Amino acid sequence: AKVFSRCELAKEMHDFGLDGYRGYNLADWVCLAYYTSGFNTNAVDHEADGSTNNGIFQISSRRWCRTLASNGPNLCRIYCTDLLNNDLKDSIVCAMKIVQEPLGLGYWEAWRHHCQGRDLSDWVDGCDFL
């Protein structure tokens, strides 16, 4: 239902206060979204164990959100399908809870494999709102 451009997404995330949150800057978050969902707020990925990864940050039904038949701790206290909204707020809130765990953004494979260990300033370069 919505695919953000890079700077549009950066602007929304800046509005949500993610620049510097838990020591990660805006670029970290933009890079994460790109490599998890390609900036698609409606993305769903179905893993081999049948769990789902959901929304802009590809949040997992095994731990963080609730689906039926795949019961779990549902730590964000939210149906998975509610993380598929055009409005980012619930995905943001849930990602914030995830990054409070010891790994931070290292919890995402996509971030470890494409964003960590790299200069990411490119991801926010040229952005009008800044």
Rounded CA-CA distance 65/79 in Å is 5
**Experimental technique:** X-ray
CA 25/CA 80 separation, integer angstroms: 26
Q: Which amino acid is it at 77?
A: R
Q: Coil, strand or helix: which one is 112?
A: helix
Any idea what DSSP says for residue 88? -
Q: 3-class SS at 130?
A: coil
SS3 readout for 8-70: HHHHHHHHCCCCCHHHCCHHHHHHHHHHHHCCECCCEEECCCCCEEECCCCEECCCCCECCCC
Fold for 1-130, please state it.
Answer: Lysozyme (1.10.530)
Contact 104, 110 (CB under 8 A): no
